[PDB]
mmCIF file of C-alpha atoms in Angstrom:
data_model
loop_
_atom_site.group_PDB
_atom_site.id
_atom_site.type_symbol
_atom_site.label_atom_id
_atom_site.label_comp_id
_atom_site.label_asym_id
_atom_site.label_seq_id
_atom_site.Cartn_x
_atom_site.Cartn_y
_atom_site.Cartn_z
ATOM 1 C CA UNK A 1 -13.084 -0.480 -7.707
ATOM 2 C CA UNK A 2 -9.956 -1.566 -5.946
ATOM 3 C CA UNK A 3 -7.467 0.648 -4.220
ATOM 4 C CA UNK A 4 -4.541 1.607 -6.128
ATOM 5 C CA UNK A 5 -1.566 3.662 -4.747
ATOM 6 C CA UNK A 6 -1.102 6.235 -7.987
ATOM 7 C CA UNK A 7 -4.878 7.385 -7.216
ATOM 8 C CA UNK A 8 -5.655 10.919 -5.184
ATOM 9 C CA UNK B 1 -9.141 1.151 23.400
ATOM 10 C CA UNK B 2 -11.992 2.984 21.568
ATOM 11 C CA UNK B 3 -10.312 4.163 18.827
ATOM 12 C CA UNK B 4 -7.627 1.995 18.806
ATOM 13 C CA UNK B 5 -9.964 -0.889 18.899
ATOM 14 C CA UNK B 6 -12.019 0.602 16.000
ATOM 15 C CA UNK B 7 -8.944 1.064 14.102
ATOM 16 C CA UNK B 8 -8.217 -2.228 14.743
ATOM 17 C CA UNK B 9 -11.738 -3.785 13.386
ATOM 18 C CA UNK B 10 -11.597 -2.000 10.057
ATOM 19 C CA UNK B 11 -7.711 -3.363 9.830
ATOM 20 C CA UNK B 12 -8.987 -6.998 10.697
ATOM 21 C CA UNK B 13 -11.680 -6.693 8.522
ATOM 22 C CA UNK B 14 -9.671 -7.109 5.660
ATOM 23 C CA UNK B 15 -9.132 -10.813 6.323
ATOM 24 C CA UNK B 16 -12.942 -10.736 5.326
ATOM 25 C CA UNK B 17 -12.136 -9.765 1.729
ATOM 26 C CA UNK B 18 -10.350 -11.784 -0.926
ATOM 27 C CA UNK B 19 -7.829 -9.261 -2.562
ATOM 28 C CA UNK B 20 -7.471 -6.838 -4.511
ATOM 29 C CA UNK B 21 -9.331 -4.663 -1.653
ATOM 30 C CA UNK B 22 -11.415 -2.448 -2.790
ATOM 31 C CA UNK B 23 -11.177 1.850 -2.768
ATOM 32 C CA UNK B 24 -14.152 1.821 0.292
ATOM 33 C CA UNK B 25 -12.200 -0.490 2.284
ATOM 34 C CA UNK B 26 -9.232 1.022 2.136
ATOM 35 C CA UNK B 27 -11.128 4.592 2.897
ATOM 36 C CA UNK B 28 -12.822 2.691 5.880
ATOM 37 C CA UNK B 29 -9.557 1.985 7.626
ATOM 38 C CA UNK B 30 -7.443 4.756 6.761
ATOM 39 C CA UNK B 31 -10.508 6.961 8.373
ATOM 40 C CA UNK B 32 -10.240 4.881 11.501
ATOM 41 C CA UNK B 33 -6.560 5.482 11.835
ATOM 42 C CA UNK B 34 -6.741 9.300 11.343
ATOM 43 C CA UNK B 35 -9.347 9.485 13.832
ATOM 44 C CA UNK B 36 -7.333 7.563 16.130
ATOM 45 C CA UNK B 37 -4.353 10.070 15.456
ATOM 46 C CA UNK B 38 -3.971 10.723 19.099
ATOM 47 C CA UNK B 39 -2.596 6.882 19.346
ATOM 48 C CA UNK B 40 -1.173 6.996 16.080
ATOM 49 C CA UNK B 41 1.772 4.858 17.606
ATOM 50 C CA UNK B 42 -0.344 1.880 18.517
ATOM 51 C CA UNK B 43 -1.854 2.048 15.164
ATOM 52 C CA UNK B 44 1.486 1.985 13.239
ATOM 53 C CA UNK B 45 2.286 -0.926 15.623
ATOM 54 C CA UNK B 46 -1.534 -2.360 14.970
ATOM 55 C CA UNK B 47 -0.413 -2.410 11.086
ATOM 56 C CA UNK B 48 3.339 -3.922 11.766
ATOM 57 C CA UNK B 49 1.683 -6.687 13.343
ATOM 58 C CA UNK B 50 -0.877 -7.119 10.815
ATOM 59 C CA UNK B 51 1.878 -7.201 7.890
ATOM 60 C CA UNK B 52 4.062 -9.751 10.465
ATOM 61 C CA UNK B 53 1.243 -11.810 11.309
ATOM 62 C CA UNK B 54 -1.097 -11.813 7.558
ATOM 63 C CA UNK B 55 -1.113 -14.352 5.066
ATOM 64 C CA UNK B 56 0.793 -14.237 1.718
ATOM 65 C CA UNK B 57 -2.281 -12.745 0.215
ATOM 66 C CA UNK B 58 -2.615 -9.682 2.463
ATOM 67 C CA UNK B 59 0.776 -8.433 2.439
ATOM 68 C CA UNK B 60 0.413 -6.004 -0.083
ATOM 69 C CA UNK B 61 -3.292 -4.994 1.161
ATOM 70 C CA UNK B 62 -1.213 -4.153 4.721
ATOM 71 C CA UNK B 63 1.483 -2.094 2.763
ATOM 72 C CA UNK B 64 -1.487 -0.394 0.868
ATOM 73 C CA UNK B 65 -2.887 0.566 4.484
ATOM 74 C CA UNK B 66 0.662 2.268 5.244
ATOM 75 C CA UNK B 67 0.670 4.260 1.599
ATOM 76 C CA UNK B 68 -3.361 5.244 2.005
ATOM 77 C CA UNK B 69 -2.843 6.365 5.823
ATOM 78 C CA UNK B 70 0.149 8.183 5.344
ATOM 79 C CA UNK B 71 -0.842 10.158 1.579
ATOM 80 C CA UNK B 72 -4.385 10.834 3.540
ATOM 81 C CA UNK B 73 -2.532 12.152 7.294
ATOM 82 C CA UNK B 74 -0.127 14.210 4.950
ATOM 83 C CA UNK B 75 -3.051 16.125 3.101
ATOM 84 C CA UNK B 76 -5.244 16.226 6.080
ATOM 85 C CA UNK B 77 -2.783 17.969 8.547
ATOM 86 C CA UNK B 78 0.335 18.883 6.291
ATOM 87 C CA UNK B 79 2.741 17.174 4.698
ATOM 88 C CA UNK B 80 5.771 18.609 7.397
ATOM 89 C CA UNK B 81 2.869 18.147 10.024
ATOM 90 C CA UNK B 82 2.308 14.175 9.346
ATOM 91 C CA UNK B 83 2.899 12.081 12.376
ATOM 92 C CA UNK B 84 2.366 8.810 10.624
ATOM 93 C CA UNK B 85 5.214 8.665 7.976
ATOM 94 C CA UNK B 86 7.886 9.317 10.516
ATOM 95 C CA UNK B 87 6.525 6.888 12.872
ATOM 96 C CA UNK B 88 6.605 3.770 10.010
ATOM 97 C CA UNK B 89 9.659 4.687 9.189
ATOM 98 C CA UNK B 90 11.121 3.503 12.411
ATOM 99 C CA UNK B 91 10.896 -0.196 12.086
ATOM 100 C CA UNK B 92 10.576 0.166 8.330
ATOM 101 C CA UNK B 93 13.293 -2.558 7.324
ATOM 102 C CA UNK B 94 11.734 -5.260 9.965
ATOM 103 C CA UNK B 95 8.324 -4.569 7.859
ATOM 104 C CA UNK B 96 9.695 -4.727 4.282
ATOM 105 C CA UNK B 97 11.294 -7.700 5.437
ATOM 106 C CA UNK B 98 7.362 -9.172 6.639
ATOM 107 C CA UNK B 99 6.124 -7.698 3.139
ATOM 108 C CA UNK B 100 8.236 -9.556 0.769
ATOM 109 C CA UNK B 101 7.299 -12.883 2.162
ATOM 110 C CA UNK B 102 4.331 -12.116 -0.003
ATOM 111 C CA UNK B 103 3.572 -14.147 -3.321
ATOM 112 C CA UNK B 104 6.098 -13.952 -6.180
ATOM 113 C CA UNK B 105 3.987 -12.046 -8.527
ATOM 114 C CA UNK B 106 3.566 -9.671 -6.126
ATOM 115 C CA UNK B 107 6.426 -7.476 -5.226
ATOM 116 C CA UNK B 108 6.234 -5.763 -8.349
ATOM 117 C CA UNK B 109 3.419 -4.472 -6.630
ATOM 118 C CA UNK B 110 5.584 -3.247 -3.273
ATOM 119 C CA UNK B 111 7.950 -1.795 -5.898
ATOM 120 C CA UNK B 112 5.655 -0.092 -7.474
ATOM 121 C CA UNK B 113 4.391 1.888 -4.070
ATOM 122 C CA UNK B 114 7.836 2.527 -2.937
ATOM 123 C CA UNK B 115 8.863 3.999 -6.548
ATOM 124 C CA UNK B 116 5.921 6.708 -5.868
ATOM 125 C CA UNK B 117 6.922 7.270 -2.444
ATOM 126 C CA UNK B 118 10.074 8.516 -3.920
ATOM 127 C CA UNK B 119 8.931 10.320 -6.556
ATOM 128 C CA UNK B 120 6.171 12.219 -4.561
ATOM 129 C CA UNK B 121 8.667 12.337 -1.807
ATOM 130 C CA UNK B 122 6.667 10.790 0.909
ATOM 131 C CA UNK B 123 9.339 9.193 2.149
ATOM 132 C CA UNK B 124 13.102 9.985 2.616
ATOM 133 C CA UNK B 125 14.803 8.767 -0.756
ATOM 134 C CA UNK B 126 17.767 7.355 2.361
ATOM 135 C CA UNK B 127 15.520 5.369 4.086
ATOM 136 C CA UNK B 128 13.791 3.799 0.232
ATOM 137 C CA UNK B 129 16.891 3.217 -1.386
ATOM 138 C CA UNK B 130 17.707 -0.326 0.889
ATOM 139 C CA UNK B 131 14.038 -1.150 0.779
ATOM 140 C CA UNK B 132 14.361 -0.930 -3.010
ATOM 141 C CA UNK B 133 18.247 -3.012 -2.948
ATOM 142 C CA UNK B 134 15.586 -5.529 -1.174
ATOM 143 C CA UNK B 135 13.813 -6.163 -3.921
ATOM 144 C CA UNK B 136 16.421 -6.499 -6.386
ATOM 145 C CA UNK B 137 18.521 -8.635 -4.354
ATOM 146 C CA UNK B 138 15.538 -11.465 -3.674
ATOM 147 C CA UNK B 139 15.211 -11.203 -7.615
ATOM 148 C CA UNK B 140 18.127 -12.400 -8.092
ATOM 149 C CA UNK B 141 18.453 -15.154 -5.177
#
């Protein structure tokens, strides 16, 4: 699961 | 260096990864950096270089360190209380600058991270606005 900027 | 030096292993560490970098990574590093908070200047200037210094590939990865450390710093101590934001915003045209020597298909990606900062107001909408004008004028060129 990458990391994604609109995620808490 | 301690925790400088351990912030910068997690940040290097991402040249062991072939983007997109993963949600533990990112937690890995950004971790490192707020437990480093008391040289939170020579870890903004750790991720400058980084983002000056990267390949093509990694240049969103490095702007993806400054939104995770930043949104994590603001909810651990307080938004108004946030050292980090205020700090990368000094030299914040030099590393947009760095950051769009990244691949094509990729600032939509750098767009898409500074049209959140202004929406959630991490960032002053004065100092996003010519970061924005950036993108739109390489677009074009």
């Amino acid at each position: 699961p990458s990391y994604s900027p609109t995620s808490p | 260096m301690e925790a400088v030096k351990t912030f910068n292993s997690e940040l290097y560490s991402l040249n062991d990864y072939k983007p997109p970098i993963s949600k533990a990574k990112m937690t890995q590093i950004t971790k490192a950096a707020i437990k480093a908070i008391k040289f939170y200047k020579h870890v903004v200037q750790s991720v400058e270089k980084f983002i000056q210094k990267c390949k093509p590939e990694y240049k969103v990865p490095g702007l993806y360190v400054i939104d995770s450390i930043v949104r994590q710093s603001r909810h651990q101590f307080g938004q108004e209380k946030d050292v980090f934001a205020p700090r990368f915003s000094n030299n914040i045209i030099s590393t947009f600058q760095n950051l769009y020597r990244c691949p094509g298909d990729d600032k939509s990606k750098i767009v898409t991270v500074l049209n959140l900062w202004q929406k959630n107001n991490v960032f002053k909408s004065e100092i996003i606005q010519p970061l924005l004008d950036m993108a739109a004028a390489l677009e074009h060129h």
